[PDB]
Amino acid sequence: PTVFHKRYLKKIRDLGEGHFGKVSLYCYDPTEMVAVKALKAPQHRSGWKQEIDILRTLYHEHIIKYKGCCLQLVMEYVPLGSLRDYLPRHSIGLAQLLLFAQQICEGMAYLHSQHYIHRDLAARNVLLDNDRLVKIGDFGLAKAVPEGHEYYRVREDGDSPVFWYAPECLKEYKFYYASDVWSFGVTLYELLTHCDSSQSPPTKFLELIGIAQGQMTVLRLTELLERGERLPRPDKCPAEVYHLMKNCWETEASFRPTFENLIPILKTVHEKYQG
Numbered sequence: 190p191t192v193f194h195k196r197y198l199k200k201i202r203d204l205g206e207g208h209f210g211k212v213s214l215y216c217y218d219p220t221e222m223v224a225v226k227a228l229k230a231p232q233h234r235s236g237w238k239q240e241i242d243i244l245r246t247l248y249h250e251h252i253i254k255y256k257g258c259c260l261q262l263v264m265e266y267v268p269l270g271s272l273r274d275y276l277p278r279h280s281i282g283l284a285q286l287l288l289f290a291q292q293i294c295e296g297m298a299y300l301h302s303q304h305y306i307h308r309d310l311a312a313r314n315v316l317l318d319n320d321r322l323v324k325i326g327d328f329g330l331a332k333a334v335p336e337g338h339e340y341y342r343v344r345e346d347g348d349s350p351v352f353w354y355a356p357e358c359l360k361e362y363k364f365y366y367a368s369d370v371w372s373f374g375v376t377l378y379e380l381l382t383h384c385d386s387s388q389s390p391p392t393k394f395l396e397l398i399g400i401a402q403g404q405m406t407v408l409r410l411t412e413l414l415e416r417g418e419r420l421p422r423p424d425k426c427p428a429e430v431y432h433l434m435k436n437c438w439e440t441e442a443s444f445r446p447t448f449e450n451l452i453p454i455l456k457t458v459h460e461k462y463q464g
């Protein structure tokens with residue numbers, strides 16, 4: 190739609206980076222603040238084409254706004270950044286954390302109804318607009334679920350967010366809509382630990398696995414997940430919220446709530462704490 194011209198984009202700062210992509214804050218000055226995502230200098234390029242196409246077709250209050258092209262991806266600038274960056278610095282209350290959790294489920298329910306799985310649902314991908322507004326802000330691993338199949342066939346990459354993954358992704362390389370609920374449960378844990386690094390999923394799971402394990406991190410991970418071991422209950426996380434988390438972490442994908450199931454549950458649980 191909108192065609193931003195590169196010569197008018199004024200770099201302000203970096204907002205994020207991955208092994209294949211970078212997001213920068215720009216000032217579009219043809220005489221507005223934009224987040225522009227660029228792929229680094231064919232498989233990652235084809236995946237990049239699908240990424241832009243995926244966000245082009247998404248419109249939801251809890252999904253970062255697609256703003257047009259420049260290929261570079263121009264998106265709205267979400268002012269307070271990732272909850273991963275925000276949370277260790279702002280002691281947000283339980284009620285607001287649960288509102289964020291609900292807002293994530295809404296955007297996820299919407300994403301899922303569009304037949305897309307996210308595959309990278311983490312606090313680093315949840316952007317804070319204001320103290321009462323959150324948006325899923327990155328779709329780098331988002332894929333369409335093929336029409337005659339209930340999941341997408343992943344394939345291992347060294348950069349897979351394995352500490353946010355259900356055993357089916359790690360073992361069978363099958364990503365279901367239910368696999369994003371697992372990730373959501375991990376994002377909910379992150380939010381309740383205030384994104385504290387010493388409490389993070391890679392820190393906590395590597396403490397459980399150990400680091401002398403050769404090529405066997407994923408395998409030791411899958412087997413502890415299969416033994417029913419899980420991330421611990423965050424300090425000051427209510428018993429009920431912890432049980433909802435564990436329910437998101439059922440080993441059986443079908444036993445997990447869907448995002449639709451989570452919306453009324455979170456709505457009720459937020460209303461309770463907001464009082």
Ligand SMILES: N#C[C@H]1C[C@@H]1C(=O)N[C@@]12C[C@@H]1CN(c1nc(Nc3cnn(CCO)c3)ncc1F)C2
Pocket residue numbers: 204205206207208210211212224253264265266267268269270271274275313314315316326327329
């Ligand atoms: N892998 C990989 C890496 C490259 C992919 C990446 O950076 N994706 C993103 C989720 C990050 C941030 N981001 C965006 N961030 C913002 N706002 C904003 C304000 N402060 N900050 C920094 C404190 O977090 C960010 N508005 C739009 C965005 F799009 C998009």
